[PDB]
Amino acid sequence: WALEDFEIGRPLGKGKFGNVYLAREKQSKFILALKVLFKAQEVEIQSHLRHPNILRLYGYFHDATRVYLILEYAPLGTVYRELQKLSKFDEQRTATYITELANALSYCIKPENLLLGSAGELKIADTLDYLPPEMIEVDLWSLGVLCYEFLVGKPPFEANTYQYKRISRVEFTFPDFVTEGARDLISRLLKHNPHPWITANSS
Ligand SMILES: CC(C)CCNC(=O)Cn1cc(-c2ccc3c(-c4nc5ccccc5[nH]4)n[nH]c3c2)cn1
């Protein structure tokens, strides 16, 4: 593989995905993504690591100065930016994201590192808000924080400053529209000490 085999379009992710580019394999015309790194400053496992809710790494290559990561392109963007569109997601929507995500974590986390496929299906790529108390003093806690933020439009522990305490003491509450099925799953996940609503609502 070489840089010259690819057409480059626009940067895709301006926010520390700011080095991944819309790209296109020259011969087949297939649309792809290209992440570019300067060597001056892993890749082998993610290659034969295939799953529908995980972005493919298709390969890597380098030259005298840089390293290039050939990645699947997710046409519909980040889950993050959909959340900013719709302000919050309906139950049907969040529930299918969650099982998609549990499926991803099973085979193996933030709305901005989450991408959307051709059919709107979620795929994983790769401060405080999504971190468990243990980890600040885990991917199930994260799932809990994500399920809340999908139904609600903000993460459950949002405060003005970083001064931590809300998370460590699990102080969070629900607006009323959030059903007990939703509440139960979330409250089970957001336990300080490290499903019917998920079926029913999903695919
Ligand atoms: C060694 C290995 C672990 C590296 C593989 N991971 C990375 O290179 C980090 N990374 C960036 C991405 C990334 C970021 C954004 C996109 C996108 C994408 N599509 C978009 C469509 C509209 C708006 C934004 C979009 N971003 N597609 N694929 C992506 C892939 C995925 N992984």
Swiss-Prot record:
UniProt miscellaneous comment: Centrosome amplification can occur when the cycles are uncoupled, and this amplification is associated with cancer and with an increase in the levels of chromosomal instability.
Task: Give the gene name.
Answer: AURKA
Which positions are annotated as binding ATP? 16, 35, 72-74, 112-113, 126
Domain Protein kinase span(s) in chain numbering: 6-198
Glycyl lysine isopeptide (Lys-Gly) (interchain with G-Cter in SUMO2) crosslink residues? 110
Subcellular location(s) per record: Cytoplasm, Cytoskeleton, Microtubule organizing center, Centrosome; Cytoplasm, Cytoskeleton, Spindle pole; Cytoplasm, Cytoskeleton, Microtubule organizing center, Centrosome, Centriole; Cell projection, Neuron projection
Summarize the record's induction comment.
Expression is cell-cycle regulated, low in G1/S, accumulates during G2/M, and decreases rapidly after.
The post-translation modification note in this UniProt entry reads: Phosphorylation at Ser-168 decreases the kinase activity.
Indicate where the modification Phosphoserine is found in the sequence: 168
Gene Ontology molecular function terms on file: ATP binding; histone H3S10 kinase activity; molecular function activator activity; protein heterodimerization activity; protein kinase activity; protein kinase binding; protein serine kinase activity; protein serine/threonine kinase activity
Q: Which UniProt keywords apply?
A: ATP-binding, Cell cycle, Cell division, Cell membrane, Cell projection, Cilium, Cilium biogenesis/degradation, Cytoplasm, Cytoskeleton, Isopeptide bond, Kinase, Membrane, Microtubule, Mitosis, Nucleotide-binding, Phosphoprotein, Proto-oncogene, Serine/threonine-protein kinase, Transferase, Ubl conjugation
What is the uppermost EC class here?
Answer: transferase
Q: What is its EC number?
A: 2.7.11.1
The activity regulation comment is: Activation of CDK1, appears to be an upstream event of AURKA activation. Phosphatase inhibitor-2 (PPP1R2) and TPX2 act also as activators. Inactivated by the G2 checkpoint. Inhibited by GADD45A and p53/TP53, and through dephosphorylation by protein phosphatase type 1 (PP1). MLN8054 is also a potent and selective inhibitor. Activated during the early phase of cilia disassembly in the presence of CIMAP3. Inhibited by the small molecule inhibitor VX-680.
Record's function text: Mitotic serine/threonine kinase that contributes to the regulation of cell cycle progression. Associates with the centrosome and the spindle microtubules during mitosis and plays a critical role in various mitotic events including the establishment of mitotic spindle, centrosome duplication, centrosome separation as well as maturation, chromosomal alignment, spindle assembly checkpoint, and cytokinesis. Required for normal spindle positioning during mitosis and for the localization of NUMA1 and DCTN1 to the cell cortex during metaphase. Required for initial activation of CDK1 at centrosomes.
Protein name (database record) = Aurora kinase A
Question: What is the species listed in this Swiss-Prot or TrEMBL entry?
Answer: Homo sapiens (Human)
**Shown portion of the whole protein?**
128 to 388 of 403
Q: Name one process (GO BP) from the record.
A: positive regulation of oocyte maturation
Q: What tissues has this protein been observed in?
A: Highly expressed in testis and weakly in skeletal muscle, thymus and spleen. Also highly expressed in colon, ovarian, prostate, neuroblastoma, breast and cervical cancer cell lines.
